[PDB]
């Protein structure tokens, strides 16, 4: 849950802060967190399930890191970041939907979807950052 929330928070920060013309110093820590998320998710295969009418969806992460070279972010940088952010946002939304439609009588506080259960593994703990909601 904290890893999923951290993914969503990183994506929201990227959408809000990775904008044309912004100083790289405004995004340096955000870029580092986003690249950490990319490294952590790369090479992992996820499936969001087919409960009800939710389509079964497969997710592969083979993304390159975001650049660190520009003093101010330009349009090309924002477009590449937008592509990656769109894929990640789709994945996170699908995982959230898969988790919301499930329930358990024995352990209802524990993750029910397989994607969130996988994200509870230790290898994803690196993604975890500010939990302020």
């Amino acid at each position: 849950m904290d890893v999923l929330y951290s993914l969503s928070k990183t994506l929201k920060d990227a959408r809000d802060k990775i904008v044309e013309g912004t100083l790289y110093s405004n995004v340096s820590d955000l870029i580092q967190q986003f690249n950490q998320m990319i490294i952590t998710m790369n090479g992992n295969e996820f499936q969001t399930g087919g409960i009800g009418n939710l389509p079964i969806r497969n997710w592969n992460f083979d993304f390159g890191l975001l650049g660190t070279t520009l003093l101010n972010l330009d349009a090309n940088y924002v477009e590449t970041a937008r592509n990656t952010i769109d894929y990640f946002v789709d994945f996170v939304d699908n995982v959230c939907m898969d988790e919301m439609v499930r329930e358990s009588q024995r352990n209802g506080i524990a993750p029910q979807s397989d994607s969130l259960r996988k994200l509870s593994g230790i290898k994803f703990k690196r993604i975890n950052f500010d939990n302020s909601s």
Partner: protein, 779 residues
């Protein structure tokens, strides 16, 4: 250089061939005796050790078996062709062949012996080889002990040769070299279906010597740096040094009667320095050896060349102090004075480099953008074709960063230098003009450096690890100025022969490294599983380092060797070595019990026990097992030196079994057995508190005994109070020992695959880079 000689002298791997079957046992004729001890006229063949040299003491026996493991690993071949071992079986009906000559000797001895049964002679007459030429297979009859057969069958079925063809030879070339349009590869031979080769073992570093073995990693990186220097191509058709010096003098407007900074701009501009800089840069990036910057702050041309150098080379390639000094000189000599900013008061040990502070403080977009790029220009760690590589930024590879640097420099030239005398601005402008009169040459040089780097990087087999090294390679900034001022339009790329030589040296070193790792791991794991607690393993590791041929073990402390031992101990054993050790572990008890020099123990009972009947002994006081007897371990007794228990048991006549590899006396005297001499050999244990001198008596009572009539004339079965814990030899069954050893009928093994590849380069003027454009484009 001695380092280059040591690294390039390494041969691929000594290919081992088997010339005879590995044997621990041989048949031997022995006299046999009847149940009453009378000698039978017929003899019998028994399995015996060929070299019966097993030592006394269980610990020494385990040491002997470790040594035997080493011997078997030495004798294990890479491939085997049994026809090389095949000899004529003279008694074969078809005049066929057998392997090896030792089998032929056994066959002759059995066939000629008058006591041999006719069925065995028929069987020997049927022993011949079968050739299946269609399958390229041959089977040969061989006479082997079951353990000998197990070892030789393992050798036959686990050979290291694989089929070799033109496609394999071509794919042996690195994929990036084949994918390069600048090289044309050719072959003039069709390798036959019977061609073979042995793959190098290119496993990536299992010892992680880049992590915490800083001295060893320094040595490794120095060797890599020297080799890379040896393979980096020389610059051709450099601009004439005299002509360039004249042109620079005209541009600088040198004045005889005035002291000027611009004069120093001409310092150290020569082709030797240019070639040295080119080689140093590419070799340092290839070996991932840290570089150190050497410059004189009074030379501003050195600082402008350093600006180019920090633009193109990622800054982690430089030791931090030298990079900080160079950046501070650049900031305080060119940038801040240009923009009228107060001189940066930079603290030694600052978390930020001078360029990071300047980037935060510089309001000019071009200068700050170039500063940001220099601050963030890093290598990219990428696994290509299974090897970790440090890849340059694509804008470095195509040379666009040169344009960004030139934009920054042109912005600096336009500044007023408000707080400086006009001659200072003139000097800085003259240096910038020297650099910017060669903008196209700088783009070409950046592209050439990047292309040569990646082309030679395709030839590296071991992971390129980016860690700052203990020592650095000094790079003079005047050499960078020489390279910038003297580089022409001639494209130089690594020769295909140079690429193949570099790749072969890397493969040889990698294979040797992995093979020595395997040897050390096998020995260490075997010594641990053989419980050799008194064995100090430093020697093993020492030998390991000595066989890498690039370290001076005199400079390696013992603590480092034991850390290497600890890291090696965690690695799994190679499959062939592990299986050989499994065979040795499985069969060592049987090999030890076959020795006639040692017994497995002695049972001291204090009651009469009838001597056992065994045809190869007559009557003998042998114990097949230690059942019903308390066991005292002689190894533990010798290790602890506490003799209270054994002393109390011997003084109280308490039946016991002393267990451990012991020498024994063979005594055929009936009178000695009646005298009960075997029971008189243990008081010395109490007297001296030593068991290394213990030597129990083994009675061998039969008709060859002088006083055997006592056995014969009194219907008397001999009895003894002591027994020797020993096994009896196994009969040699000729038919059971015959095995058909199968191998390939014939093949040829090849060593250097790239010898079959002739490679050439396109015209350098037409050589292209990754972006399909020519590496160098200036007129």
């Amino acid at each position: 250089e001695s380092i280059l000689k040591k690294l390039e002298d390494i041969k691929p791997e000594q290919v081992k061939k088997q010339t005879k079957l590995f044997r621990i046992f041989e048949p031997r004729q022995l006299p046999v005796y009847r149940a009453n001890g009378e000698k039978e006229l017929r003899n019998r063949w028994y399995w015996k050790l060929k070299r019966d040299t097993l030592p006394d003491g269980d610990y020494d026996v385990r040491e002997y078996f470790l040594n035997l493991y080493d011997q078997v690993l030495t004798e294990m071949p890479d491939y085997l062709l049994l026809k090389d071992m095949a000899v004529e079986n003279k008694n074969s009906r078809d005049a066929g062949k057998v392997v090896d000559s030792e089998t032929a000797a056994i066959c002759d001895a059995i066939f000629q012996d008058e006591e041999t049964e006719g069925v065995v002679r028929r069987f020997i007459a049927e022993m011949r080889q079968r050739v299946q030429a269609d399958r390229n297979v041959v089977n040969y009859p061989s006479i082997l002990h079951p353990i000998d057969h197990a070892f030789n069958e393992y050798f036959l079925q686990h050979q290291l040769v694989e089929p070799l063809n033109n496609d394999i030879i071509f794919n042996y070339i690195p994929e990036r070299i084949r994918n390069d349009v600048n090289y044309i590869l050719n072959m003039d031979r069709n390798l036959p279906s019977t061609a073979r080769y042995i793959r190098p073992n290119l496993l990536q570093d299992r010892l992680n010597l880049h992590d915490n073995f800083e001295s060893l990693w320094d040595t490794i990186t120095t060797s890599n740096y020297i080799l890379a220097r040896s393979v980096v191509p020389d610059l051709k058709e450099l601009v004439s040094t005299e002509a360039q010096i004249q042109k620079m003098s005209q541009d600088l407007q040198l004045e005889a009667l005035t002291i000027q900074s611009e004069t120093q701009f001409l310092t150290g501009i020569n082709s030797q320095a240019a070639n040295d800089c080119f080689k140093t840069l590419i070799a340092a990036m290839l070996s991932q050896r840290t570089m150190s910057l050497d410059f004189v702050t009074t030379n501003y041309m050195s600082l402008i060349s350093g600006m180019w150098l920090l633009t193109v080379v990622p800054n982690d390639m430089f030791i931090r102090e030298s990079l900080v000094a160079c950046q501070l000189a650049i900031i305080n000599t060119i940038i801040y004075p240009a923009f009228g900013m107060q001189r940066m008061h930079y603290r030694n040990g600052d978390p930020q480099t001078p360029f990071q502070i300047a980037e935060q403080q510089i309001q000019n977009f071009q200068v700050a953008n170039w500063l940001h790029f220099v601050n963030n220009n890093q290598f990219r760690q990428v696994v290509i074709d299974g090897v970790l590589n440090q890849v340059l930024n694509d804008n470095i590879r195509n040379g666009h960063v040169v344009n960004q640097l030139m934009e920054a420099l042109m912005q600096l030239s336009r500044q007023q230098f408000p707080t400086m005398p006009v001659d200072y601005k003139r000097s800085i402008q003259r240096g910038i003009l020297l650099l910017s009169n060669r903008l196209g040459q700088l783009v070409d040089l950046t592209r050439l450096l990047a292309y040569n780097y990646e082309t030679l990087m395709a030839c590296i087999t071991m992971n390129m690890q980016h860690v700052q090294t203990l020592t650095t390679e000094k790079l003079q900034l005047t050499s960078v100025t020489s390279l910038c001022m003297l580089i022409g339009n001639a494209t130089v790329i690594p020769s295909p022969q140079t690429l193949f030589h570099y790749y072969n040296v890397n493969v040889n070193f990698h294979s040797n490294y992995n093979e020595r790792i395997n040897d050390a791991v096998a020995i260490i794991t075997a010594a641990n599983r053989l419980n050799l607690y008194q064995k100090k393993m430093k020697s093993i590791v020492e030998d390991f380092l000595k066989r890498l041929q690039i370290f001076d073990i005199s400079r390696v402390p013992d603590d480092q060797m034991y850390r290497l031992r600890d890291r090696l101990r965690l690695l799994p054993v190679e499959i062939r070595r592990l299986d050989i050790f499994n065979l040795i572990l499985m069969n060592m008890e049987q090999i030890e019990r076959a020795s006639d020099k040692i017994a497995q123990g002695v049972i001291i009972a204090y009651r009469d026990m009838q001597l056992e009947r065994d045809e190869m002994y007559g009557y003998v006081n042998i114990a097949r097992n230690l059942d019903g007897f308390q066991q005292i371990n002689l190894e533990e007794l010798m290790r602890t030196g506490d003799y209270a228990q054994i002393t109390n048991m011997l003084l109280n006549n308490q039946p016991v079994a002393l267990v451990g590899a012991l020498p024994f006396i063979t005594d055929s005297s009936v009178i000695s057995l009646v005298a009960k001499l075997d029971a008189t050999v243990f008081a010395q244990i109490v007297k001296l508190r030593k068991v290394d001198t213990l030597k129990p008596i083994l009675y061998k009572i039969n008709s060859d005994s002088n006083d055997f009539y006592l056995v014969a004339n009194y219907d008397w079965v001999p009895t003894s109070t002591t027994k020797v814990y020993k096994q009896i030899p196994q009969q040699f069954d000729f038919r059971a020992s015959m095995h058909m050893l199968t191998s390939n009928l014939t093949f040829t093994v090849y060593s250097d695959l790239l010898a079959f590849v002739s490679a050439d380069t396109v015209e350098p003027i037409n050589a292209v880079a990754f972006d399909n454009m020519r590496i160098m484009n200036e007129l």
